[PDB]
């Protein structure tokens, strides 16, 4: 199955009474694994399989690094705000991570956003940064002048990140590698006079990745299909739906199992 590891860094300038000036959170797939903020000033586990498998020196070491990265983010956001002639509260975001695909091939990404919009995107294949505007271009030139740092980031995304992900996947295998098949049903109802709505609803499934579609006489629909978001049910499982207006069948694919519900 496809898995991913990613670490986010969020900086907010001039924050309100309760908003932290810096937050860092780690994820393995959709699961939070780590947290840090400018209020606690401590890196902490956010999954019991993280807490149990990483010794206290891991949290002590990363607490120090994150205190440093928080300071660096404060300065970077001051510099960015000066480049744009911005005042007031602005945000800076970083996302680094990797994916280990089902076929054994990998992906890696390192991106920055300013005020929640794409700002700088690293291309680990040409060792270059893609800049959205002249301000991002100024930063891009400085980063691109440091060849060793580009090579280090490529090595991190391609080797270290994947090794961390495989380690974490083993720690939380009972959660991340389990499968809870969906409970699926088709509901029929006359809505507006002469308009019959068909809802194919799924719930209780894990992983959240599901494929749902409506077919007509075995062939794909050309009519409008409405899709529900894949939502957390709060118990570790997910729910989703697909609807059409009316031989119809709902097709559901989840973790290598296909299901058909003929109306």
């Amino acid at each position, epitope marked *: 199955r496809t898995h991913s590891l990613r670490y986010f860094r969020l900086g907010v300038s001039d924050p309100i009474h309760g908003v932290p000036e810096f937050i860092s959170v780690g994820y393995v797939d959709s699961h939070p694994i780590t947290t840090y903020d400018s209020v606690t000033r401590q890196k902490e586990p956010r999954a019991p399989w993280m807490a149990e498998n990483l010794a206290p020196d*891991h949290w*002590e*070491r*990363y607490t*120090q*690094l994150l*205190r*440093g*990265w928080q*300071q*660096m983010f404060k300065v970077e956001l001051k510099r960015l705000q000066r480049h744009y002639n911005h005042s007031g509260s602005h945000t800076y975001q970083r996302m680094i991570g990797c994916e280990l695909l089902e076929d054994g091939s990998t992906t890696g990404f390192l991106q920055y956003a300013y005020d929640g919009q794409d700002f700088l995107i690293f291309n680990k294949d040409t060792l270059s940064w893609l800049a959205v505007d002249n301000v991002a271009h100024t930063i891009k030139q400085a980063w691109e002048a*440091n060849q*060793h*740092e580009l*090579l*280090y980031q*490529k*090595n*991190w995304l391609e*080797e*270290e990140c994947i*090794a*961390w992900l495989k380690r974490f996947l083993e720690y939380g295998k009972d959660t991340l590698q389990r499968t809870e098949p969906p409970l699926v049903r088709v509901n029929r109802k006359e809505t507006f006079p002469g308009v019959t709505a068909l809802f194919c609803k799924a719930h209780g499934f894990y992983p959240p990745e599901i494929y749902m579609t409506w077919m007509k006489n075995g062939e794909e629909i050309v009519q409008e299909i409405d899709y529900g978001d894949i939502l957390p049910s709060g118990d570790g499982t997910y729910q989703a739906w697909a609807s059409i207006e009316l031989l119809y069948s709902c097709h559901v694919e989840h973790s290598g199992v296909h299901m058909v519900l003929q109306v």
Partner: antibody
Amino acid sequence: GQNIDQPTEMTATEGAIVQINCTYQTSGFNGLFWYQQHAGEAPTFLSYNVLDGLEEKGRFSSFLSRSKGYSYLLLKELQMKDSASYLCAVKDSNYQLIWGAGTKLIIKP
Amino acid sequence: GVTQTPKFQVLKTGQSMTLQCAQDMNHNSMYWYRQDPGMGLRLIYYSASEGTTDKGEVPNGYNVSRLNKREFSLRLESAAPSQTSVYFCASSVWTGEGSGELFFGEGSRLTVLE
């Protein structure tokens, strides 16, 4: 990580070539540095490698093989002024440096 | 770049000592190492940035203060003969996360005698 090994000492002739090896066994890899340290002086940065290949800076070149877990520092056209200790250091998974015990290089005039 | 003091010092066991280190390179991380024959540099304490410090591999008998971004002092509260060593202060542009090299001070030779 855990261990970094480099020879204690090496002797070579002025005008010739010397290769200083550094092997490492670590929990993660984020780069390998070489420092020069003249007797009684501070260490000074010489090179950095993190991907496979050889990089050259003047008479000094630094190689890395990630799969064999080793690097070498190669000095060409040896001069008396190259008499010094050469320190190998590796950055582990937690971005911590692990230092080799250094190699003292002796040049025979 | 890195200014370290003193170059030499003789101490009697039990005496206190403060080693000074300053850098004007706007570096974030500062480190205190000891260098002993037949072994690699050993980290005593370090400071990832202004406002934080933490133990290295050999912190027993020492403490540090990150006074500001520029300065990182090393203190021997009660000097012991085993602390006879060569002390190196070092700094890096950012934290250990990166490819950045260390910049070393000139070294401080301390001899602790009964």
